[PDB]
Design a protein around this ligand. Structure first.
Ligand SMILES: CCCCCCCCCCCCCCCCCC(=O)OC[C@H](COP(=O)([O-])OCC(O)COP(=O)([O-])OC[C@@H](COC(=O)CCCCCCCCCCCCCCCCC)OC(=O)CCCCCCCCCCCCCCCCC)OC(=O)CCCCCCCCCCCCCCCCC
Ligand SMILES: CCCCCCCCCCCCCCCCCC(=O)OC[C@H](COP(=O)([O-])OCC(O)COP(=O)([O-])OC[C@@H](COC(=O)CCCCCCCCCCCCCCCCC)OC(=O)CCCCCCCCCCCCCCCCC)OC(=O)CCCCCCCCCCCCCCCCC
Ligand SMILES: CCCCCCCCCCCCCCCCCC(=O)OC[C@H](COP(=O)([O-])OCC(O)COP(=O)([O-])OC[C@@H](COC(=O)CCCCCCCCCCCCCCCCC)OC(=O)CCCCCCCCCCCCCCCCC)OC(=O)CCCCCCCCCCCCCCCCC
Ligand SMILES: CCCCCCCCCCCCCCCCC[C@@H](O)O[C@H](CO[C@H](O)CCCCCCCCCCCCCCC)COP(=O)(O)OCC[N+](C)(C)C
Ligand SMILES: CCCCCCCCCCCCCCCCC[C@@H](O)O[C@H](CO[C@H](O)CCCCCCCCCCCCCCC)COP(=O)(O)OCC[N+](C)(C)C
Ligand SMILES: CCCCCCCC/C=C\CCCCCCCC(=O)O[C@H](COC(=O)CCCCCCC/C=C/CCCCCCCC)COP(=O)(O)OCCN
Ligand SMILES: Nc1ncnc2c1ncn2[C@@H]1O[C@H](COP(=O)(O)OP(=O)(O)O)[C@@H](O)[C@H]1O
Lengths: 320, 98, 121, 104, 44, 459, 49, 347
């Protein structure tokens, strides 16, 4: 039976599935750090589910098949164009920022739903609570205007207030010159165009706003490049923590029921992302909207409900 | 009608006007509602006793019971209003317009 | 309301036994056909809302829609016919019971009725 | 962005004669266009127009105009033979009409 | 060449608290997207 | 007469069940077949009407209108399949559904034997036309036009409903046969005057009258081609049919009450004919010509003589056909040039000779050339008005001159002269447009061969 | 295919399908029987046949 | 709020209105009104915010005042006749007090001021209950005592309600206030025919309830509470927009849609007894309601407003909780005109 008010009425509760090992873990670091491998190792050692960083096409991997869709149908933005031409006049930078924030919101909703329904913990690679560092980096470098950051702030205020912050925040601290050296050694032709001021602004926003704010609600475990390879040590520090300061121990069964009803039904999760605020970067005309929607509808498995598509081989349609 | 009935009716009318005037506070209007209820109770019991309607004697008591509910209800709302504004003033209840 | 208060009226019957003396509507009544059409339209709208192949998503659901609409429509038509028959019966009874208020007037022919003529010019 | 919308450019006119010299102006696909023209011409000019006009031209005389002419000939012949007036002013018999008794 | 469709300028007429804005209602603000006004800094 | 109504309700699902590239063919073929079937109602008794059932009856006035509507639908389908080529299948099917619903409502309107049912369908015709105008128009004014086209109707027709039910509470029935047989004179009183106004104003604004014509130019200009066709050819005749059906009870109050409406109709016919001369747009000229012709029809109905009724019916049919053809001719040029200005594209005779011939024939039939049915109706109305009063001819005569002027003016502005030197995208005329023009024009001559079919019941 | 469980499976929920079909059949036979009884009762009351 | 508490509060509201509608004693009717208000107050505050709190406060104050005057009318009627049965209620003063109290409970003008505000404050689910279910009890009480209703007062209040609803709806951009003003106009329409025939009142109530239900469930399906937010759903669920336009056309009163059936019938019922001016005024005023419905339809489906980029993601997700009775409500709200005579089954 799909979870709902009736399933909550008799039997199923949420607090009886938490086994003290929920520990929503968020790993944060500057561009081109070891945060991804650290997150994978933490998830493996602690037995939690690893959530890779939400990219442009994260939502494509949750619906239909995992194959990503065309950039025109999903995203309508690219990271390579942002790196090559950050000051473009088509509004690519803020469009990408808003799409990435929405993808991170969807991923956080998915992780919370999994944790509430199963009880096994999740390890994210970046949360919606730390997505604003890139926004501040773009704004300080002149990549985006002020109205874009105002719209982002409005969307964040109306969206992120409905969820619970991660139990413990893990930060990987890497100096800017080391980041530049790793970027140069990596080899991707587009990432070599990332200026030092961008990374410096990212790390300044991190250390000045994100960590001080998270210290008031969670436990922050800052690390370094050298100590980020021995994942056993960080696992021991995580498992020898005192989780008593956040709002998580202050949640009752009704609050968990409301949160579980909210995290599923992703339409309510993404409702406030498309507020009727008309910014030239994100607003799309009626004709292009109609053309792109018609193109999306003609996809092999997107015309009907996920179970009523004869194109992808569904059978017994006339009796479902 | 004797003067007692008209005095009770005048008391009810005065309480209704006082409720409808809404000076500054909210507790005053709740007091006006309770006064209207008291006037209704007195009128009803006088009418019942005068005509010797025996079964109707429990009618006023039920009245009083629901009065309490109304009072409780109002007080509850007042508390919330205070917790939102720090003051039970009716001037603050203006977020919604026509 | 005129028929709300009537002697010998059971409150919540919806179909008094006296209504059984009237001919039941035929199963091929056009109003029943329209009720079935309404059920079919409701089923099609249900298919459209859920993003399903509108014409042939669910045959059992559409069949249930049509059957429920026809089932309700049969009894609705029965009650409507009973109510109209009762109104006609009461009107005729009251007309018969008060002959002075509904007199039989004279039957004049147009040869003696004088109607003024209006030329068109 | 010194603009207001992410709008598509306005498309230019599509010419049906570019990819189809004999287009008939019905559709892009030549076969369905040719068949559309054929059915339009057959059911508009051949079936409906000519057959409908020849059916209307030969409708039976239900308006009763030949019958009225024959009746008029018979009545005129009879009335003129007997010397009666060809036409009578009173449409109805005065004997069947009862006027008011007096006008004072 | 194509049928006219509303743009941002045409859409912004339906964005205010009320239509037909007079001087008195010019300072009326539209309600928040979620029907939650920001908490007031009530010094108690 | 369900043999005509049911095939339309079967045209609906077959349109919704057709292939993506075969909707137009099926719709056109079966609409033409339905028109051929409906052509069988022209056999009318000279005594009384054909009463098929308790709800539907056909008279000598209803049959030409039914034939005109059933013939109209295929022409609208043919004219609509040019600007809708880029549309999606679902929206094309929706457009065809609107057209089919409009035809069905018109067919059931023209044959309803009860006045309340006639009102219900005569108002149900509003929804599809409004949807078409406000959804498939081109300019930003269409919405405004739609609003006008709605309210100018409803504010004139809401009182009528009240009058209708009031009549049913007084006479006891609203069936047309009972109404005609049991008709009684109306005394001179304020109550009867307002009853007359309520019964008349809806059909007056549906013609429209000169003072209430402001919605017509907007509706006819901002609508798509099929909307303009259906508005100017059949939707205008609803008011005339309603007045001709409803004037039976209004006597003898009509003779006193018709003076302001007759004066307005005559002077507004003159004014709109004069307005047609100084017009920078092309569709507005045709709209105002329609207004003038409908004002003439209003005069004919108001004077209430058999010759006037015959002329009114003939003029209604002829104007419907001619205005439809003119709107199609203007739409072809609009598709070529993507503008409605009259002086933009000039000298089109040297580039489109056959279209020039079609323009000439349409303009000739617009100015009442003998022996076309346009002149038959116009001359019958003129003779009836002259019998009504010998001075009226002056006004009528004036209109005639002005009419010819503006007609030829248009024919000279768009066809003669030299080309604009900078419009190089005037492709040769397609077969579809020429076929549409021929199917518009040939029935006019075929009818002027046998006019008694379109002269109404007074024949 | 679909990466998700597709709650509407490759086969219909035969319990609900059976319930709906049985409900439709029961309603239809009930309507038939009720109409037969009603016409018989009307004929008996009016004494026609 | 716990689901058990929510469902028991809803059941208590329904029990209160049942007690009102099945009781022959005046005191039991008053008790039912009190129970309905007491159990309805927390339903509005299910989602806690200052706007919901102040909407609940205004609703409670209005309902408490109405109950006070209702009980005073009952006591006066008892004073002038020792009768408790809900009956003719001969006394003019008591009848006037009861009429005013029931008008304020219903929201008729000039007691309409609370209707647009409260609807704005509460959630759509809460709003739907307030506009649809909270009208049965006062209308039932009015129907039972309709024969004693002074026609002048009732007709004046109904005409004022129609005019005020039509004028107020012209200005609002928020959907909830538009729905509230439409509800006020519809209440005026049904209240107008009450002294002449209560069957038409019941029929108009049923059709208005069906139309309002379909409207609100369609608004819940596409979670938009403003005109601009509703202008986006054409890019996500066009079928919802088309159904919404058809429902708005029906609510406007256009034939052959179902919404034309009550008005027409009401007009007919008012013409049987020499009331000509008033129905004409009502029709010409309801033209305003049609106008603002048409404006909403223009903004919603008949045109295509610009959309946003993030809407693309919404293209990949389906609506999870599906309302079962929405298609039936839509069908009964539009295609039910040809079954007009079945209204005879309402008496
Ligand atoms: C003719 C006149 C016709 C009537 C007039 C119109 C009636 C309108 C009724 C308004 C009701 C409001 C409403 O339910 O929302 C509308 C709802 C849409 O709201 P939604 O957003 O889906 O609701 C979210 C939930 O309310 C979210 O709530 P939750 O998750 O907190 O609640 C849990 C859930 C699940 O409930 C349970 O768990 C049951 C537990 C049983 C406990 C028993 C306790 C008993 C006491 C001890 O309960 C409900 O959803 C509501 C239950 C209502 C029960 C009513 C009983 C009578 O759609 C409808 O209800 C249908 C509308 C039309 C109804 C039919 C009308 C014609 C008949
Ligand atoms: C008086 C006589 C009868 C007349 C009564 C009225 C008409 C009938 C009753 C109406 C209700 C029934 C159907 C309505 C629900 C259907 C939902 C729908 O959207 O249809 C799409 C659906 C196509 O979808 P699909 O095939 O799944 O794939 C394409 C995707 O859906 C892709 O879909 P998409 O979402 O991507 O497409 C986008 C589109 C999607 O949006 C829509 O398609 C609009 C949906 C219609 C609105 C529903 C209104 C509810 C009913 C009220 C009707 C009012 C009537 C009064 C007159 C006023 C009209 C407003 O949105 C737009 O384009 C926006 C444009 C704005 C236009 C504004 C106009 C909207 C209102 C029009 C209402 C006209 C009346 C309904 C006519 C039928 C329409 C299907 O159409 C159909 O295939 C089914 C149509 C009906 C099938 C009939 C077949 C019967 C059985 C076959 C055999 C026949 C007998 C054999 C025996 C022979 C003896 C051997
Ligand atoms: C009296 C004459 C007797 C003639 C006997 C044969 C009659 C056949 C009639 C056929 C039906 C009319 C067809 C009209 C559509 C045009 C078709 C077309 O495109 O042809 C291209 C074809 C090939 O040319 P092309 O090189 O491709 O052309 C390239 C450019 O477009 C360049 O093209 P275009 O420069 O050659 O332009 C076409 C040409 C011709 O095209 C047209 O204008 C057609 C429209 C005619 C006038 C329409 C307005 C007046 C309406 C009167 C209605 C009368 C109905 C009679 C029955 C009609 C049955 C269909 O223009 C004109 O001739 C000037 C038009 C104005 C004529 C004024 C006539 C006044 C009334 C005459 C009296 C009528 C009653 C007589 C009996 C009275 C009692 C004793 O050339 C022709 O077929 C010309 C047709 C011959 C001209 C007929 C003119 C008189 C017709 C009167 C009606 C028929 C009377 C029958 C009873 C006996 C008399
Ligand atoms: C506009 C569409 C409305 C549809 C309404 C919902 C339809 C489905 C709901 C199922 C219907 C069953 C409800 C009642 C059945 C059993 C209860 C029965 O005993 O009720 C009795 C009789 O039932 C009801 O009275 C009538 C119910 C019939 C409803 C249909 C009317 C719809 C209006 C006509 C438009 C056509 C709609 C077509 C619908 C498909 C009450 O008699 P009574 O105690 O003496 O009345 C006292 C109050 N009065 C006198 C003032 C009225
Ligand atoms: C391109 C080249 C052009 C030039 C070449 C032309 C070649 C020669 C062709 C010219 C022919 C000369 C015409 C001479 C007239 C002959 C035909 C005429 O005499 O027939 C008429 C017949 O005319 C028809 O009646 C015309 C009927 C009109 C058809 C209606 C149009 C079809 C419907 C399509 C939809 C239109 C909608 C309109 C709404 C009403 C006479 O009718 P009538 O003398 O009395 O009855 C005769 C039969 N009776 C005596 C047994 C009774
Ligand atoms: C495009 C906009 C056009 C607007 C046109 C609207 C005007 C229509 C004309 C008036 C309509 C209302 C008339 C009422 C309907 C007829 C019913 C009837 O005849 O009953 C009369 C009642 O007549 C009336 O009450 C009419 C009152 C009018 C009130 C509304 C006035 C509307 C505006 C008045 C001027 C409109 C006329 C000219 C308008 C021209 C267009 C601009 C008889 O009363 P009884 O009860 O039978 O008693 C008599 C025996 N003792
Ligand atoms: N909100 C954002 N704005 C712009 N770019 C972002 C944003 N979020 C993530 N990215 C991009 O995602 C890329 C990959 O992230 P990163 O952790 O630095 O590399 P890796 O996956 O190898 O650890 C980075 O180049 C970063 O710029």
């Amino acid at each position: 039976l799909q979870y709902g008010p009736l399933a909550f009425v008799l039997g199923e509760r949420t607090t009886r599935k938490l086994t003290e090992t929920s520990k929503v873990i968020t790993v944060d670091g500057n561009i081109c750090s070891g945060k991804g491998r650290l997150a994978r190792e933490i998830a493996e050692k602690l037995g939690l589910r690893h959530f890779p960083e939400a990219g442009i096409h994260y939502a494509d991997s949750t619906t239909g098949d995992g194959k990503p869709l065309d950039v025109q149908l999903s995203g309508n933005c690219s990271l390579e164009k942002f790196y090559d031409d950050p000051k473009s006049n088509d509004g690519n930078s803020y469009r990408l920022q808003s799409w990435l924030y929405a993808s991170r919101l969807l991923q956080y909703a998915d992780a919370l739903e999994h944790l509430l329904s199963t009880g096994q913990g999740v390890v994210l690679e970046r949360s919606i609570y730390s997505d604003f560092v890139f926004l501040e980096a773009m704004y300080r470098q002149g990549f985006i205007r002020k109205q874009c950051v105002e719209h982002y702030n409005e969307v964040k205020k109306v969206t992120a207030c409905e969820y619970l912050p991660p139990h413990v925040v893990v930060y990987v601290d890497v100096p800017v010159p080391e980041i530049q050296s790793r970027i140069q050694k990596k080899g991707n032709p587009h990432e070599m165009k990332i200026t030092a001021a961008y990374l410096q602004d990212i790390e300044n926003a991190y250390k000045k706003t994100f960590l001080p704010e998270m210290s008031e609600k969670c436990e922050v475990l800052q690390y370094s490049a050298r100590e980020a390879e021995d994942a056993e040590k960080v696992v021991e520090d995580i498992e020898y923590l005192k989780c008593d300061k956040g709002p998580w121990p202050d949640q009752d069964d009704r609050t968990f029921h409301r949160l579980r009803m909210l995290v599923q039904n992703k339409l309510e999760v993404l409702n406030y992302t498309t507020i009727p605020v008309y910014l030239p970067e994100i607003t799309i005309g009626a004709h292009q909207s109609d053309r792109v929607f018609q193109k999306f509808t003609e996809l092999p498995g997107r015309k009907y409900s996920p179970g009523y598509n004869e194109d992808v081989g569904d059978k017994w349609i006339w009796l479902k | 009608m004797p003067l007692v009935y008209m005095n009770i009716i005048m008391a009810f009318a005065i309480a209704l006007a006082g409720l409808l005037m809404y000076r500054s506070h909210l507790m005053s209007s709740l007091l006006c509602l309770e006064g209207m209820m008291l006037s209704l109770f007195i009128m009803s019991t006088l009418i019942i006793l005068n005509t010797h309607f025996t079964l109707a004697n429990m009618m006023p008591i039920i009245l009083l019971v629901f009065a309490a509910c109304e009072a409780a209800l109002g007080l509850s709302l007042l508390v919330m209003v205070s917790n939102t504004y720090g003051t039970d003033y009716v001037q603050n209840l203006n977020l919604l317009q026509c | 309301t005129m028929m709300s208060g009537r002697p010998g009226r059971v409150p919540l019957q919806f179909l008094p036994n006296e209504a059984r003396s009237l001919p039941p509507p035929k199963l091929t009544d056009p109003r029943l056909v329209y009720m079935g059409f309404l059920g079919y339209c409701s089923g099609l709208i249900d298919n459209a809302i859920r993003r399903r192949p509108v014409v042939s998503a669910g045959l059992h659901r559409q069949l249930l829609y049509v059957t429920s609409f026809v089932f309700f429509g049969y009894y609705l038509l029965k009650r409507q016919d009973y109510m109209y028959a009762l109104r006609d019966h009461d009107m005729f009874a009251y007309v018969k019971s008060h002959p002075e208020d509904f007199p039989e007037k004279d039957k004049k022919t147009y040869g003696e009725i004088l109607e003024e003529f209006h030329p068109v010019r | 962005p010194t603009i207001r919308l992410q709008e598509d450019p306005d498309p230019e006119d599509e010419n049906l004669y570019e990819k189809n010299p004999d287009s008939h102006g019905y559709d892009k696909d030549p076969i369905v266009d040719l068949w559309n023209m054929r059915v339009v011409f057959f059911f508009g000019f051949s079936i409906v127009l000519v057959l409908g006009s020849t059916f209307v031209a030969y409708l039976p005389d239900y308006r009763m105009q030949e019958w009225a002419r024959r009746e008029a000939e018979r009545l005129v012949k009879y009335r003129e033979a007997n010397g009666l007036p060809l036409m009578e002013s009173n449409c109805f018999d005065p004997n069947k009409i009862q006027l008011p008794e007096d006008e004072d | 060449a194509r049928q006219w469709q509303p743009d941002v300028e045409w859409a912004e007429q339906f964005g205010g608290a009320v239509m037909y804005p007079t001087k008195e209602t010019a300072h009326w603000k539209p309600p928040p997207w979620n029907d939650v006004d920001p908490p007031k800094d009530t010094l108690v | 007469m369900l043999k005509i109504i049911i095939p339309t309700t079967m045209l609906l699902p077959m349109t919704w069940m057709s292939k993506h590239n075969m909707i137009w063919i099926n719709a056109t073929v079966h609409s033409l077949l339905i028109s051929l079937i409906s052509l069988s109602l022209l056999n009318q008794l000279g005594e009384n009407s054909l009463n098929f059932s308790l709800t539907f009856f056909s008279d000598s006035l209803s049959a030409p209108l039914l034939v005109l509507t059933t013939w109209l639908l295929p022409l609208m389908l043919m004219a609509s399949q040019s600007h809708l080529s880029k549309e999606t299948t679902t929206r094309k099917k929706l457009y065809i559904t609107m057209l089919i619903l409009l035809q069905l409502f018109l067919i059931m309107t023209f044959t309803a034997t009860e006045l309340i049912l006639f009102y219900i369908l005569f108002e149900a015709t509003l929804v599809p036309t409004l949807i078409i105008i406000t959804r498939w128009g081109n300019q930003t004014e269409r919405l405004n036009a739609g609003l006008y086209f709605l309210f100018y109707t409803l504010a004139g027709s809401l009182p009528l409903l009240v009058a209708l039910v009031y009549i049913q509470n007084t006479t006891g029935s609203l069936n047309f046969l009972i109404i005609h047989y049991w008709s009684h004179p109306l005394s001179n009183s304020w109550s009867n005057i307002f009853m007359w106004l309520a019964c008349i104003m809806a059909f007056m604004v549906k013609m429209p009258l000169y003072g209430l014509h402001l919605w017509l130019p907007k509706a006819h200009v901002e609508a798509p081609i099929a909307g303009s066709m259906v508005l100017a050819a059949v939707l205008l005749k609803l008011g005339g049919y309603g007045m001709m059906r409803i004037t039976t009870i209004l006597n003898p109050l009509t003779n006193y009450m018709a003076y302001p409406f007759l004066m307005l109709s005559m002077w507004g016919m003159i004014m709109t004919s004069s307005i047609c001369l100084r017009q920078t747009d092309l569709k507005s000229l045709i709209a105002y010509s329609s207004v003038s012709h409908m004002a003439l029809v209003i005069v004919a109905i108001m004077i209430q003589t058999p010759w006037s009724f015959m002329g009114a019916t003939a003029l209604m049919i002829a104007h419907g056909l001619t205005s439809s053809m003119l709107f199609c001719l203007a739409n072809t040029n609009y598709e070529r040039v993507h503008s409605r200005t009259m002086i933009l594209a000039r000298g089109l005779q040297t580039l489109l000779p056959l279209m020039a011939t079609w323009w000439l024939v349409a303009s000739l039939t617009n100015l009442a050339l003998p022996p076309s049915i346009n002149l038959i109706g116009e001359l019958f109305i003129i003779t009836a008005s002259f019998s009504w009063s010998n001075i009226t001819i002056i006004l009528m005569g004036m209109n005639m001159m002005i009419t010819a002027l503006y007609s030829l003016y248009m024919l000279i502005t768009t066809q003669r002269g030299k080309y604009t030197h900078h419009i190089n995208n005037i492709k040769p005329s397609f077969t579809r447009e020429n076929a549409l023009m021929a199917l518009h024009i040939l029935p006019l001559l075929l009818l002027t061969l046998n006019p008694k079919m379109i002269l109404g019941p007074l024949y | 295919k679909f990466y998700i469980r597709e709650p509407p499976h490759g086969s219909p929920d035969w319990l609900k399908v059976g319930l709906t079909l049985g409900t439709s059949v029961f309603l239809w036979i009930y309507l038939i029987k009720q109409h037969k009884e009603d016409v018989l009762e009307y004929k008996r009351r009016n004494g026609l046949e | 709020m716990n689901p058990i508490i929510y469902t028991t509060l809803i059941m208590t509201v329904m029990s209160g209105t049942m007690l009102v509608m099945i009781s022959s004693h005046w005191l039991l009717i008053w008790i039912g009104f009190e129970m309905n208000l007491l159990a309805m107050i927390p339903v509005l505050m299910k989602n806690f915010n200052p706007r919901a709190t102040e909407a609940a406060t205004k609703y409670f104050l209005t309902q408490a005042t109405a109950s006070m005057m209702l009980m005073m009318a009952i006591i006066i009627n008892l004073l002038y006749s020792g009768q408790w049965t809900i009956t003719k209620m001969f006394n003019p003063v008591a009848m006037t007090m009861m009429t005013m109290a029931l008008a304020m409970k219903l929201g008729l003008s000039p007691f309409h001021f609370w209707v647009p505000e409260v609807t704005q404050g509460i959630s759509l689910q809460a709003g739907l209950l307030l506009l649809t279910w909270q009208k049965l009890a006062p209308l039932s009480v009015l129907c039972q005592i309709s024969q004693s209703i002074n026609p002048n007062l009732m007709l004046t209040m109904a005409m004022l309600s129609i005019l005020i609803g039509g004028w107020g709806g012209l200005n609002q951009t928020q959907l909830r206030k538009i729905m509230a003003y439409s509800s006020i106009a519809h209440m005026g329409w049904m209240t107008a025919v009450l002294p002449y025939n209560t069957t038409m009142t019941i029929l108009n109530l049923l059709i208005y309830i069906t139309m309002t239900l379909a409207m609100f469930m369609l608004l819940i399906h596409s979670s938009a509470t403003t005109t601009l937010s509703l202008s986006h759903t054409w890019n996500k669920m066009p079928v919802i927009t088309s159904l919404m336009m058809v429902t708005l056309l029906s609510m406007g009163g256009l034939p052959p849609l179902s919404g034309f059936m009550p008005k027409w019938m009401i007009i007919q019922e008012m013409t049987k007894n020499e009331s000509i001016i008033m129905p004409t005024l009502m029709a010409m005023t309801a033209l305003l309601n049609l106008y603002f419905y048409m404006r909403l339809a223009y903004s919603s489906s008949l045109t295509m407003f610009p959309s946003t980029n993030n809407m693309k993601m919404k293209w990949q997700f389906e609506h999870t909780k599906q309302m079962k009775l929405l298609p039936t409500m839509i069908v009964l709200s539009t295609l039910v005109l040809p079954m007009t005579p079945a209204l005879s089954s309402l008496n």
